[PDB]
Nucleic acid binder design. Structure first.
Length: 619
RNA sequence: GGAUAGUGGCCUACCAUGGUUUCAACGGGUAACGGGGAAUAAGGGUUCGAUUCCGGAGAGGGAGCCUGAGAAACGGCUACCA
RNA sequence: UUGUAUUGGAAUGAGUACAAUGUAAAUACCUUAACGAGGAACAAUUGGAGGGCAAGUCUGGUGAGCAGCCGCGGAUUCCAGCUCCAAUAGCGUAUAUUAAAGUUGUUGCAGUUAAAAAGCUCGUAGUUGAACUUUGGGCCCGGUUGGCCAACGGGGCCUUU
RNA sequence: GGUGAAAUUCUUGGAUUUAUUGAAGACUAACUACUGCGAAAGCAUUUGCCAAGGACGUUUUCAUUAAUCAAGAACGAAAGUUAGGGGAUCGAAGAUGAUCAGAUACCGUCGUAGUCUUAACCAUAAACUAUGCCGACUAGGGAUCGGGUGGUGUUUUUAAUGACCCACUCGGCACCUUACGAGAAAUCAAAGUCUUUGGGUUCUGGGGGGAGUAUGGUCGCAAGGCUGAAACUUAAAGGAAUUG
């Protein structure tokens, strides 16, 4: 324009015309104060609503579990020293589950003791507790091969709350300052796993043991997310009726139960309940979901994986052809692509190696908007709720009766399923290695995975994590030595994103188990296409100002012609293309972005579709 | 005139029409107990003081009262509200 | 007489402990017989290395990370290893406040063109308001400080008082 | 007739043009400027009446009666509102002609309200010298407006007066040169007498947006005027000057 324009601190009316196309309240001191008071009334009423569940003998019991980390201890010493401070000897037998009422704190406690021989039974016991009491020895320090693995495993499945306890520190008395030196060491060790806690009690002192007892009675535990969104109960008694109709009585602790649900027992699988009653009766009204799943030579094997993984780490996906081998018949299935992130590979491809189940598989899409929606309905439909004394009748196959034990001697526990979780789908897991598991893991090798209560034998497929616009990703032969990774298989879905633990059975080990890794249920996503990449390679050997010719990549003129269209690249990063076959031995000549030399190598990439394998329960 | 340990609209009867204010009355706000003091050093200032000493107020919220030289007391009593 | 590496005697408390002392009784400090260092493993951390702002043309990887601000990266600024810098039994971060700040200005800001002189004049409260009345000159006493003397202070009398 | 070109329109009952006369309403050319007056808005034909004002002259009179100013008050271009008058010209709205053409690219005909005036309202402008009022001091020069003093000066005549010339002086609108001074620079006789910081006094500002918005109040018949936030967002926005 060329003119110094007009200025004003606020817009002129001329400017506004071109651009074109209840009372406020003062808070008086009284009403300020009044609002704060009536807000506090809500908070206080809300705190009562939480606590009523534990309020007394009429309320629910709190579930305590004792876990000694050293066999030196004997768990009966732990419990006995606690019971003394209750100051009622009427409290203080051929059994490992105990119900106690404490007059001193008007509190109901259930104590469960696991059988320390059965490592897997420890996890199952601790999985249901509100409080886990860790026993430590002042005399002998925990062993890395067993004692620590208890702590590490419990953390990764999740713990409602934890207490550190000592019971025998006087066994190293000279002066109690020497006891304090040891106690400081144990606290520093314990805090490494549980940095929220800074105290370990000495039960040899009356003041500490009373302090522990008070806490168990008075304080509330944390919730466990994946558990409390389901229902669960612990059996007070079990009974059998005629193929069976197994009866359990106990207390509701989760979100709740409905007689039309499905019920999982961790050792035995899914079963249907037929009736419920409250200690009114509820019956399975047949407008219900149903039980349908659809609609020394080993040294050579270990050495093989050790050698193969070392090779794959140096020269990944490189392949050797051989003379008298047809490249077509070997490789015709491979499509060949410029870039996985840009290819239009179809998900539910019709190729014959695709599993027989496809329409048979459940597919969800928006897992997030599915998960939260399902829960909202489930909590509304609950019939029995926390603290209800209940009986339940369950369709129980009579031949499994040989596996039942008296619940007074062994933990028997019951979990409700979410509706579609019985159906199989494509599922995805995060995975990273256990604390020092340096062994090679082959992508096809079978593994046992626990996630939530249930556990399955799985053969995975490994891939790296990224957000490709098409969900196509490279299949990988072995688990990366360091990064987190994504593993894919077919299994029954979980909506709660339970933590997952990865291990392999090994009865040669003291705990019968070898621990491999941990992770999380990410999602069901069938679009998570895996492509098996292959690299062929050949040697450029003669060089001209406009073309280079390459040996050994192919051995027949017919093969050079059939694969002519796939682009070439150098590992030094130049691209190129086949011109034509030269001669009968399968030489070719090619053009590239620039100068090559015999110190470079010429490669080409090809890709094949992969599909997940199915999986089966484990016990 | 009554009442009080005692002065005084402190209260009662009768009578007069006064009292404060742009030198900011009256009203509203304070995550406001006051002071000795604390931090920050060119000088002038700015910000803070629930808290070891001095003074005031209260004992879940309002009101009433016995004993005693002294209390409108709450590790004294009586009633209502929660 | 100063640096860089194989080798030798000396020195000591952290810690433990007989005893005495301490204390209402004790613990600890102060004192002390015995024991107590060679990778003296009896092993010091917390943040940084483009500029503001002390200190890397080092070297390997990569093409999500860093960054109060300016900026780096499709690599002196990312990640890893060497080396180097700063404070050190302490060092970093968040929020509030003070100084540097003459961005609240009494001391001490600014208003043509950068934020800011009201269209114009009258006028009450408020702030502010020309000059003038005993001035000068004598004579005693006189304290302090430094060389009878000088300076600087103070009291009395006379002159129309 | 009108345009870049053309059409609507008027005309052989005579258009446009020429001559002799008359009516109405508005306006005050040239003279007219680096000139005058007024608190500002603003003010231009002649003569009469009414009342007011600055500067100058003064050996008149009173004797501190003064300067600035919250509240309160008078005036306030153009457009706009209500009622009466007037109604030439031009002309928001409205009704109409062409829709072709790149310089003439938005043009032609008719025409309501309005434009003027009387009696009441409204209170805005780039209302600008973009510079608050009162008082003192600091530099050179030749022009001009109003008053006064002097001259043995020219002219109107044989005085006075008037016109002109020369010197001085009070007051005013401006201009040219310079910078002891000042400033970011353009520039400035004040925008000087400031880190060497104090003559009196009124008003306003505190990075850019949200915003002259929301809400409350108050004035107006209405259009609208005055007063006037915060949550949130952002690293610049802005001034002067030269140059690739």
């Amino acid at each position: 324009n060329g003119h110094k324009s007009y200025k004003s601190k606020h817009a002129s009316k001329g400017a506004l015309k071109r651009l074109y196309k209840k009372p406020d309240k003062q808070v008086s001191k009284l009403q300020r104060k009044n609002k704060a008071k009536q807000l506090r009334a809500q908070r206080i009423l809300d705190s009562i609503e939480n606590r009523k569940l534990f309020e007394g003998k009429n309320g629910a019991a709190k579930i305590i579990t004792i876990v000694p980390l050293v066999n030196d201890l004997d768990p009966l010493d732990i419990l006995y020293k606690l019971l003394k401070c209750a100051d009622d000897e009427g409290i203080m037998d051929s059994k490992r589950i105990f119900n106690v009422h404490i007059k001193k704190f008007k509190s109901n406690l259930k104590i469960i003791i696991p059988d320390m021989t059965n490592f897997l039974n420890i996890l199952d016991c601790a999985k249901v507790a509100d409080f886990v009491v860790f026993g430590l020895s002042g005399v002998q320090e925990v062993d890395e091969e067993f004692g620590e693995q208890i702590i590490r495993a419990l953390e990764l499945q999740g713990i409602a709350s934890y207490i550190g306890v000592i019971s025998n520190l006087s066994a190293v008395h000279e002066k109690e300052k020497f006891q304090l030196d040891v106690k400081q060491s144990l606290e520093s060790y314990f805090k490494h796993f549980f940095p929220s806690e800074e105290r370990v009690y000495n039960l040899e002192k009356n003041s500490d043991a009373l302090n522990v007892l008070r806490t168990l009675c008075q304080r509330l535990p944390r919730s466990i997310n994946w558990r409390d969104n389901r229902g669960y109960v612990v059996a007070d008694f079990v009974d059998f009726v005629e193929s069976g109709d197994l009866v359990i009585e106990g207390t509701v602790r989760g979100i709740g139960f409905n007689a039309n649900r499905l019920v999982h027992i961790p050792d035995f699988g899914d079963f249907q309940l037929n009736k419920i009653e409250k200690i009114t009766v509820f019956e399975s009204n047949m407008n219900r979901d149903t039980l349908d799943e659809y609609a020394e030579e080993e040294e050579r094997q270990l050495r093989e994986f050790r050698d193969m993984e070392k090779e794959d780490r140096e020269f990944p996906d490189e392949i050797e052809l051989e003379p008298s081998e047809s490249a077509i018949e070997r490789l015709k299935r491979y499509r060949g692509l410029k870039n996985l992130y840009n290819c239009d590979w179809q998900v539910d491809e019709k190729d014959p190696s695709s599993p027989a189940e496809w329409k048979r598989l459940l597919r969800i899409g928006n897992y997030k908007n599915t998960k939260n929606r399902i829960i909202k309905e489930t909590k509304n439909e609950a019939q029995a709720i926390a603290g209800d004394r209940i009986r339940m009748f369950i369709r129980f196959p009579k031949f499994l009766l040989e596996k039942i034990q008296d619940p007074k001697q062994l933990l028997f526990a019951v979990y409700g399923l979410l509706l579609h979780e019985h159906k199989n789908a494509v599922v995805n897991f995060s995975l990273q290695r256990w604390e020092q598991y340096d062994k090679p893991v082959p992508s096809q090798e079978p593994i046992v995975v626990q996630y939530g209560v249930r556990r399955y034998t799985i053969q995975p497929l490994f891939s790296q994590g990224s957000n490709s616009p098409n969900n196509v990703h490279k299949y990988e032969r072995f688990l990366h030595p360091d990064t987190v990774s994504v593993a894919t298989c077919i299994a029954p879905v979980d909506f709660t994103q339970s933590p997952a633990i990865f291990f392999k059975p090994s009865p040669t080990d003291a705990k019968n188990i070898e621990l491999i890794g941990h992770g999380t249920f990410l999602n069901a996503d069938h679009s998570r296409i895996l492509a098996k990449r292959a690299i062929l390679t050949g040697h450029p050997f003669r060089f001209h100002k406009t073309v280079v010719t390459v040996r050994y990549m192919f051995f027949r003129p017919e093969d050079v012609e059939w694969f002519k269209s796939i682009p070439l690249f150098t590992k030094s990063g130049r691209s190129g293309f086949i011109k034509e076959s030269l001669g009968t031995h399968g030489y070719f000549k090619a053009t590239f972005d620039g100068k090559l030399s015999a110190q470079d190598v010429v490669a080409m990439s090809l890709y094949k579709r992969m599909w997940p394998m199915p999986s089966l329960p484990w016990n």
